[PDB]
């Protein structure tokens, strides 16, 4: 976490800061965007 | 004496005219909305 690492979470491989996100994620939704359909966040596929 | 106050009243009523609701300062708003417009266009090209 806080880092500018290469991430593969289940395949979405890429690279950024990880950070602690406040989404209201909803139970069903996995994936985060933006306005500019990009993944801003991300759901663990380990312990959530 | 009567130049002076007409002055003073048209300066007066240009305060309250450009302080009312029906802004005529459209033309430099246009200026950043077609570059806010063509950041956009140019941004979500990237999903096509």
């Given at each position: 976490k806080n880092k500018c690492v290469?991430?593969?979470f289940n395949g979405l491989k890429g690279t950024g800061v990880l950070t602690e996100?406040?989404?209201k994620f909803?139970?069903?939704q996995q994936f985060g965007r933006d306005i500019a359909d990009t993944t801003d966040a991300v759901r663990d596929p380990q312990t959530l | 004496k009567l130049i002076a106050n007409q002055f003073n009243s048209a300066i007066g009523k240009i305060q309250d005219s450009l302080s009312?609701?029906?802004s005529?300062?459209?033309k430099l708003q246009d200026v950043?909305?077609?570059n806010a417009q063509a950041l956009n266009t140019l941004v979500?090209?990237?999903s096509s």
């Open positions: 290469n991430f593969n996100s406040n989404k909803l139970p069903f | 009312s609701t029906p005529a300062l459209g950043v909305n077609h979500k090209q990237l």
